[PDB]
Amino acid sequence: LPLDPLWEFPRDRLVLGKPLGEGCFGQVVRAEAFGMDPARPDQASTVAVKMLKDNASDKDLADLVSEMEVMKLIGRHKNIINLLGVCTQEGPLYVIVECAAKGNLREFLRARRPPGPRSSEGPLSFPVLVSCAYQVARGMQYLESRKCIHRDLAARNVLVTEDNVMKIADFGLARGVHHIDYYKKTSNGRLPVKWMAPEALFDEVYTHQSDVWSFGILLWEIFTLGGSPYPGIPVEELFSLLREGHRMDRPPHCPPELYGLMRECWHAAPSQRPTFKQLVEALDKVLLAV
Ligand SMILES: *CCC(=O)Nc1ccccc1Nc1ncc2c(n1)N(CCCN1CCN(C(=O)CC)CC1)C(=O)N(c1cc(OC)cc(OC)c1)C2
């Protein structure tokens, strides 16, 4: 691998700590970094480091190099997980990125479901829920302006910082578009087919509008506080329902403005779904009202 001085970080300034999970064609580990900000060479910060499995082969490496190079290109934004540095020289390949303190948005929301003075005031309020959606839309708009189609956008792929800033994750991955087992649960027991636009699912076609569809599913997850899309519906039935043009019901405690937005995102024709710019504006006006 070539030396890229703009991104290279001394591996000995890293102290690897607890694993965060895998399935990425490698594995992600919490770490402390010293001098990530060169103005303060001895200061510690908490980061996340992606690396290969210890029994990985050349295909996994190519993919990790690829995701690295993608993250170099897309540049920096508040509402995405940002690249911090890389270790490519004299040792294993490390990709260093921001670490979000509160985990993924799905678990964030599910852990904060209200009770079934402030006795019925749960942690999550409507304006913060709308802010969560607005931030995801902002990040996706940025990703779109950098020619990046996410292809998996879901609450589990949104990370939450200590200050409750949404950061879109896993946007630089090779998805294996042409060999998806629609029936197979992932590491969570999650079925990613439930986030696929009709054009991607039936015609293997991905555009930025395909991601808008996924955003509408993600909207539904937010306002069900981390619910599972198409609740109780086996994948076999999902195929039929989608061919029949069926859509999810309006969730309880969800204003018609936001179910409206969901339904627009799930328009069968990609050209009749909102753009992320439009989503950003529509959510911003809601955020302004409340
Ligand atoms: C920072 C404090 C902390 O420990 N946070 C934490 C704890 C528990 C779960 C998650 C987090 N926070 C977190 N912060 C930053 C990143 C991650 N997590 N990643 C997710 C790890 C968990 N798990 C990994 C395996 N997996 C996959 O499907 C494969 C990725 C499910 C999730 C994480 O992977 N990060 C990440 C993101 C991106 O986005 C482009 C790219 C990376 O490497 C190139 C790494 C960061």
Residue numbers in the entry: 454 to 569, 577 to 750
From the publication, what sentences describe this entry?
Upon binding to FGFs via the extracellular domain, FGFRs dimerize and trigger protein phosphorylation to activate the Ras-mitogen-activated protein kinase (MAPK) pathway and protein kinase B (AKT) pathways. FGFR4 is mainly expressed in liver, lung, and breast tissues and specifically binds to the endocrine ligand FGF19. FGFR4 has two cysteine residues, Cys477 and Cys552, located near the binding site of small-molecule inhibitors.
In this study, we designed and synthesized the first dual-warhead covalent FGFR4 inhibitor (CXF-009) targeting two cysteines in the FGFR4 ATP-binding pocket. CXF-008 and CXF-009 possess two arms that can both reach cysteine residues located in the P-loop and hinge regions of FGFR4. One arm is 4-acrylamidepiperazin-1-propyl, which is from PRN1371 and could directly form covalent bonds with the P-loop Cys477 of FGFR4. CXF-009 binds within the ATP-binding pocket of FGFR4 and forms covalent bonds with the Cys477 residue located within the p-loop and the Cys552 residue located within the hinge loop, respectively. The electron density of CXF-009 is well-defined in the crystal structure. In addition to these two covalent bonds, CXF-009 also forms multiple hydrogen bonds with Arg483 and Ala553 in the hinge loop of FGFR4. No mass shift was observed in the mass spectrometry after FGFR4(C477A, C552A) incubation with CXF-009. The IC50 values of CXF-009 against FGFR4(C477A), FGFR4(C552A), and FGFR4(C477A, C552A) were 193 nM, 602 nM, and 1528 nM, respectively, which are 4-fold, 12-fold, and 31-fold lower than the activity against the wild type, respectively.
